[PDB]
């Protein structure tokens, strides 16, 4: 029984044979990565942007140390730290981690992956990729007057010691994510969200042997993507991945939902509920933003229909799927747990109806 995170587990991982991520990912320049481009070719595979040129991505120089983070964030903040060899969550002060990080004699491999600093002084030092901000649901549809607290999952600071490892998972709410390495190196292990892979993943996630079974072996292809310093990786909706901090590293990233793969996003959300995921508490109002998106997407469809235009295939697919989700959450036998998530400014039953006829119409007049 070789368990995840251990020294033995890392020896194998570091010497295994993985098809190169180069087989599925698209490398491009910051300027080519546009909303327009993605609406044409879609966002179905990871995108690597080697140079931060034209991304709109701004951040401290490659010399920003873990020490500078203690200053700008406040060594007092209690952050979640992972005990890699045990694959268990812990809690430390940002001050203690930095003490532990800069200490040559590291007794345990500890990793920090959830430090969201948008509500801190260091926030001013980072501007996220324009494409993320452009596609982001929170950026485009979150009201300035909701009772719900706006979700802040756009700026995370990642720090890890060599050999820290994160097992296979799907980001909360099936969010896409942008990831930039400041210094050091991270190695991603990517798995395509095919119907077969999702099934196995959920099964692997609910099996007791999960920690002793490398999920990479359970699928046809597990791609290795090395993210070196200065590079920016963009992972799309539903992608199953694991990460290995190959060397002391500091990176930045953020998650975001969008209209390109709503179906997949909803699928992942439903799965996270079936598994009871602790990460799904970062996007606690996923259902709320979904109601907001449904209202905007309805307006757009109304506009195209009343003028004789046909919506792009993906938009109809996404709305059709969003309709199914909303209708599900409204079921008498389930609404008791979804009711509070419905926005004050929306009429649930009516919105779902308008959605049904606008979709039916598109189905008929086509
Ligand atoms: O820790 C890492 O290197 C990568 N982490 C993640 O992808 C995550 O937390 O969702
Ligand atoms: Ni992740
Ligand atoms: Ni978003």
Protein residue whose Cα sits closest to atom 1 of ligand 1: 113
Q: Compute, in angstroms, the gap from residue 303 CA to the centroid of ligand 1.
A: 40
* 241 in a known ligand binding site: yes
The residue assigned the tokens 């706006």 is 150
**CATH number of the domain that 361 lies in?**
1.20.58.1360
The answer for residues whose C-beta is within 8 angstroms of residue 247's C-beta and 6 or more apart is 162, 184, 185
Ligand 1 shell residues, CB under 6 Å: 111, 113, 158, 160, 166, 171, 186, 243, 245
Identify whether residues 238 and 298 lie together within a single domain.
no
186 annotated as a binding-site residue: yes
323 in a known ligand binding site: no
Of the residues 241, 269, 285, the one at which a domain ends: 285
Check whether residue 197 and residue 317 sit in a common domain.
no
In DSSP notation, 333-344 reads TTGGGTGGGS-T
301 and 244 in a common domain: no
Give one DSSP letter per residue of 83-128, joined into a string: ETTTTEEEEEEHHHHHHHHS-SS-SS-EEEEEEE-TTSGGGGG-B-
Point out the domain boundary residue: 233, 259, 285. Answer: 285
258 annotated to bind ligand = no
Residues 286, 268 contacting (CB under 8 angstroms): no
Count CA atoms closer than 13 A to 217's CA, side-chain side.
Answer: 7
Task: List C-alpha distances in Å: 290 to 110, 282, 317, 334.
Answer: 35, 15, 15, 17
Closest CA to 290 of 254, 333, 331, 319: 319
Instruction: Give me the residue label for tokens 């747990």.
Output: 337
Q: Rounded CA gap, 192 and 221, in Å?
A: 8
Interatomic CA distance for residues 172 and 160, integer angstroms: 20
Of ligand 1's listed atoms, the one at least distance from the Cα of 249 is: 3
166 Cα nearest atom in ligand 1 = 1
- Beta strands 156-160 and 110-116: pairing type? antiparallel
Minimum-distance ligand 1 atom for the alpha carbon of 113 = 1
Distance CA 283, CA 279 (A): 8
């Amino acid at each position: 029984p070789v368990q995840a995170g251990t020294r033995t587990f890392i020896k194998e991982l570091r010497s295994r044979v993985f098809p190169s991520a180069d087989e599925i990912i698209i490398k491009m320049h910051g300027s080519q990565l546009t909303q327009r481009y993605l609406e044409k070719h879609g966002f179905d595979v990871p995108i690597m942007v080697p140079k931060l040129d034209d991304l709109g991505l701004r951040l401290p120089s490659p010399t920003f140390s873990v020490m500078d983070v203690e200053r700008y964030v406040g060594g007092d903040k209690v952050i979640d730290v992972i005990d890699v060899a045990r694959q268990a969550d812990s809690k430390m002060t940002l001050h203690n981690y930095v003490k532990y990080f800069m200490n040559p004699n590291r007794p345990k491999v500890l990793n920090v992956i959830s430090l969201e600093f948008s509500d801190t002084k260091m926030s001013e030092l980072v501007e996220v990729p324009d494409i993320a901000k452009k596609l982001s649901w929170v950026e485009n549809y979150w009201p300035d007057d909701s009772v719900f607290p706006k979700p802040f999952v756009q700026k995370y600071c990642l720090m890890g010691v060599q050999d820290s490892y994160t097992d296979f998972h799907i980001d909360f709410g099936g969010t896409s994510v942008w990831y930039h390495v400041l210094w050091g190196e991270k190695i991603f292990y990517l798995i395509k969200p095919t119907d077969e892979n999702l099934a196995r993943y959920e099964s692997w996630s609910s099996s007791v042997t999960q920690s002793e079974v490398f999920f990479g072996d359970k699928v046809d292809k597990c791609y290795k993507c090395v993210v070196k310093q200065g590079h920016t990786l963009f992972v799309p909706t539903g992608w199953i991945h694991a990460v290995l901090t190959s060397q002391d590293c500091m990176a930045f990233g953020g998650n975001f939902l969008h209209n390109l793969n709503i179906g997949m996003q909803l699928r992942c959300y439903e799965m996270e509920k079936r598994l009871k995921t602790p990460d799904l508490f970062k996007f606690p109002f996923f259902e709320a933003i979904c109601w907001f998106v449904a209202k905007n997407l309805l307006e757009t469809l109304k506009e195209l229909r009343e003028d004789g235009f046909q919506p792009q295939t993906y938009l109809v697919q996404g709305v059709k799927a969003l309709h199914t989700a909303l209708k599900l959450w409204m079921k008498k036998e389930l609404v008791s747990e979804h009711a509070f998530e419905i926005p004050d400014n929306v009429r649930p039953g009516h919105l779902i109806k308008e959605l049904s006829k606008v979709i039916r119409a598109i189905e008929e007049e086509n």
